[PDB]
Amino acid sequence: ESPSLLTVIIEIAPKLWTTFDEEGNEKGSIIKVLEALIVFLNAHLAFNSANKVAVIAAYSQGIKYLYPESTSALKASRSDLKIINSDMYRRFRNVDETLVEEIYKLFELEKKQIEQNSQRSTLAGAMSAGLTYVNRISKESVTTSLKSRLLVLTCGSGSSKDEIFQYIPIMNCIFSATKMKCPIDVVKIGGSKESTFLQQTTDATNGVYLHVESTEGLIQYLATAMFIDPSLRPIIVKPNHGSVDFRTSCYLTGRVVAVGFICSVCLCVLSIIPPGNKCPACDSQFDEHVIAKLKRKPVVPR
């Protein structure tokens, strides 16, 4: 019906993938994930002649575009390395070769810069970059009535816990994708079953969340659950099991928040009234009268 832009935000973190390899029996699961992604992107390009593909990798020290390659490299180049065979379809083959060469360049760059260890994940920035690319292609409109779809291939691996600092950018990405009617799909290849922020992302942007534990057989997951072109989203149901509760985390305890209290200024969430009669995130003094109205106990006769 209508062509679409499939933007794959893939989180290739050496730390996370090394922990995934140590948790699993096999080694080098990055290769299996990468080749399943290659076959899935070839499948998406086989779906329609005019549809488009973008890939953004979120590595340790930032983000980098994998397909298409940087225009500075386009102007400078072409050393066509022979990782992908040249007898296959050429319209898939240039895409695949550009993707694997940029994978090789990214791994060589972070092998050079391997010494610096960072606790700052760039998945949110990569998703924001993918949303900007979606907006760019939609506003350019060289192909009329182009749909768009985000697919996020992340890995948890049981090593990195939930990150509080990612909450605001992922929420902003949710609102932007909902405004542009671009679904966000998330595949989490790891041990931790629950990823609340990306689950809320899928359920609010009308995407599919899929948590998997083994890198083997990933192409069937991608071609069955993740192959939903936005042409057929309202007529194809989604396999996103495990409905998310749309809750949040307390600012000073960290637990999931039941009936609770938020600051009226900076909208921070607290499950308890903070000590010092002052907002922790906002530094506002709170009125003793109204917080005593909060601290009152319910009434019952003796």
């Binding site: 050496p14 730390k15 993938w17 090394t18 922990t19 390899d21 140590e22 948790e23 080694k27 080098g28 990055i30 290769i31 299996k32 990468l34 080749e35 399943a36 290659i38 076959v39 990782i83 992908i84 694997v100 994978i103 090789y104 791994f107 060589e108 092998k111 391997i114 010494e115 260890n117 090593s159 083994s214 083997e216 057989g217 990933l218 192409i219 069937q220 997951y221 069955t224 659950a225 149901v237 989604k238 396999p239 996103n240 099991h241 637990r255």
Partner: protein
């Protein structure tokens, strides 16, 4: 409600390097006819759960008399 060392991280990275250079056999993505069956069973159970949930969602009609 296991911190990996830089040496073995570099070893895993170099393993990925040589595995990318020597051959990327895309025909290896095909499952071995059993994990694909288990995967399709999991996906279709999720689809059945979601379809039973969202088969049906001015008030709606009731089986009660008025």
């Amino acid at each position: 409600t296991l911190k990996v060392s830089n040496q073995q991280m570099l070893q895993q990275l170099s393993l990925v390097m040589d595995n990318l250079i020597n051959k990327l056999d895309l025909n290896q993505v095909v499952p071995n006819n059993e994990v694909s069956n288990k995967i399709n069973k999991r996906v279709i159970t999720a689809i059945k759960i979601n379809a039973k949930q969202a088969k049906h969602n001015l008030e709606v009609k009731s089986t009660l008399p008025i």
